Structures are given as C-alpha cells and as structure tokens.
C-alpha cells in the first residue's frame, strides 16, 4: 500500500451533483493531513495498520524550540482520507500510464471503508473525513508549508 | 529524485499574513524532491514524465493528453520531506535529502530545462528555502508517483 500525505491547514471535498456541472460539497476539514492512499493488489490488513500508524503517529507539526515534534492527534487535528489507485498508475513504460498493479475496485472499495473505520478505533471518530469511493471529486487543498510524505508499505513487512 | 504529480483545475502560491507569488489554472503541480546523489540524468526522467504523462481525457479518450498538448501550466516546487525516511521512528529524518545550497542550483537548472522544453510561460515556482501556502484545486484527483531509481 502507497500514500501521499499532505500537510493542510483546510480542504473541501466536493462531488458532481444528481445538465450536472455543479460540484457539492460534502467532506471538510480545518487544519490537518490529507492522505492519498492507494491499495494494492495483494494488500493484508498488516500494511492496513502501517497506513493508518504513520499518517496518525508521524511527526509533521512544530513546537516553541522544537520541530518535527507534534503528530496529528496531539493537536486534535482532522485527516482527510481520499482513495488514489492512480498510485500504482505505472510509468515504467510509456507515456500513458498503466494501472494493472491497484486493486479491482468492488475488493478495494471494501478494503478501504475497513481502513476508514480502523482509522476511527484508532483516533477518535469524529475527526477521520473522508470522500467517495471511485468518483470524481474535485479537492481544494491549503498546502501548509507544502509537507509532503511519500510512504511505500511493500518497503517493508 | 521524486515527485508527487497532481492534476489540477488551478494552484494558488503563496509566501508570509500571506502574499501571492505565484498562481496558474489548469496543468498540474509537482513536488520535485531532490537526492544528494541525483544525477542530470535524474533530472530529465522527471521532467520528461512530467511534461508528457497523458492524465487528461480527451472527450471519449482516457489517459490520452499531456500539460504540452493542451498548453497547459506547470508549478514546481521542491518537496525536501519527500525523502524523509521515516521506518526508524515517528520523526523524519532527510539524511537521504539534498543539501539546500546544492540543491537550490539543481531545482534552479531543471527550471531552465523544464522552460527550454515546454514554454517559458508556461514554468511557474516558489521561493526555494521558505515556507509556503498553496492552495491546490485537485482536479480528479489524480496523484501520480516516481522514484527515479527505479528506471
């Protein structure tokens, strides 16, 4: 499994609507992390909680002297957790990028909902947002420093 | 050398209370990070994909159009934290990234070659060392990563 996680001081989520052109709104959050996560293939639950222990453990936020020192919970900050199986888009070979490596998305779309809840027993409910699997959305992101954290879990096991 | 490409309707650049710096619509941000042992070879892999990588449909296609194809824009900027290993602890550490002085002159001269291949107009940056604010309207999204030592 395959994360970007960026560093935000707000971001809104918003989807197409029921003529469409009108994006909605339905995911904010104030200050926080973004996170682009990206499941794969043969994924077990054990990269699951690597995912989820570095996005909610790492030290990406600053006190008085001390830098990299504050995760997202210490300062009761939100994450907004968005699906990006283009993560494994392929770019080896050729221009056009190949996505044979993500998951098929009826495996992957349960996968990930498991994970969003996993990621609530793990912080607390009322800060893991979310957007809609598979779907266009249309994000506007504050890029706080910009903070940008790549993490791959088949780099470890 | 990495990037993290995104696809996006527009960025919006900020530096310190903020002031503008830089903006562009449609094209596609990247956070550039730079290795202590990248080559000018790692360079022209990166601009390269960014500057030809086809993320945009084109009305029944998909996966079809490049940044170039459409005259689009392209804002680089450079992500040091992208090398932050961060398997020992909880805390980053850039031990793999490029010092800052080295560094500002490779970001420097990838601009050159970024403008030097696509349009001059069309390059857009940051202050290198300095804190920043970009608001990003990720279009899709479509988020897209390389590794260079992997070609």
Same mark, same amino acid.
């Given at each position: 499994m395959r994360v970007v996680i960026q560093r935000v001081k707000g971001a809104i989520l918003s989807v197409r609507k029921e003529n469409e052109k009108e994006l909605e709104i339905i995911s904010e959050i104030k200050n926080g992390l973004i996170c682009f996560? *990206? $499941?794969?293939?043969n994924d077990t639950w054990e990269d699951a909680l690597?995912?989820?222990?570095?996005?909610?453990?790492?030290?990406?936020?600053?006190n008085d002297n001390k830098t990299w020192d504050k995760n997202v919970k210490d300062l009761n900050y939100e994450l907004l957790i968005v699906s990006q199986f283009?993560?494994?888009?392929?770019?080896?070979? *050729?221009?056009?990028?190949?996505?044979?490596?993500?998951?098929?998305?009826?495996?992957?779309?349960?996968?990930?909902?498991? $994970? $969003?809840?996993?990621?609530?027993?793990?912080?607390?409910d009322d800060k893991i947002k979310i957007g809609k699997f598979?779907?266009?959305?249309?994000?506007?992101?504050?890029?706080?420093?910009?903070?940008?954290?790549?993490?791959?879990?088949?780099?470890?096991?």
């Open positions: 996560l *990206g $499941i794969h293939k690597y995912i989820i222990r570095k996005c909610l453990n790492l030290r990406l936020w600053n283009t993560l494994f888009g392929n770019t080896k070979k *050729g221009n056009k990028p190949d996505f044979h490596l993500a998951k098929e998305p009826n495996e992957a779309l349960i996968f990930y909902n498991k $994970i $969003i809840d996993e990621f609530k027993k793990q912080y607390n598979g779907n266009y959305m249309n994000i506007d992101v504050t890029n706080d420093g910009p903070v940008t954290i790549y993490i791959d879990t088949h780099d470890i096991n």
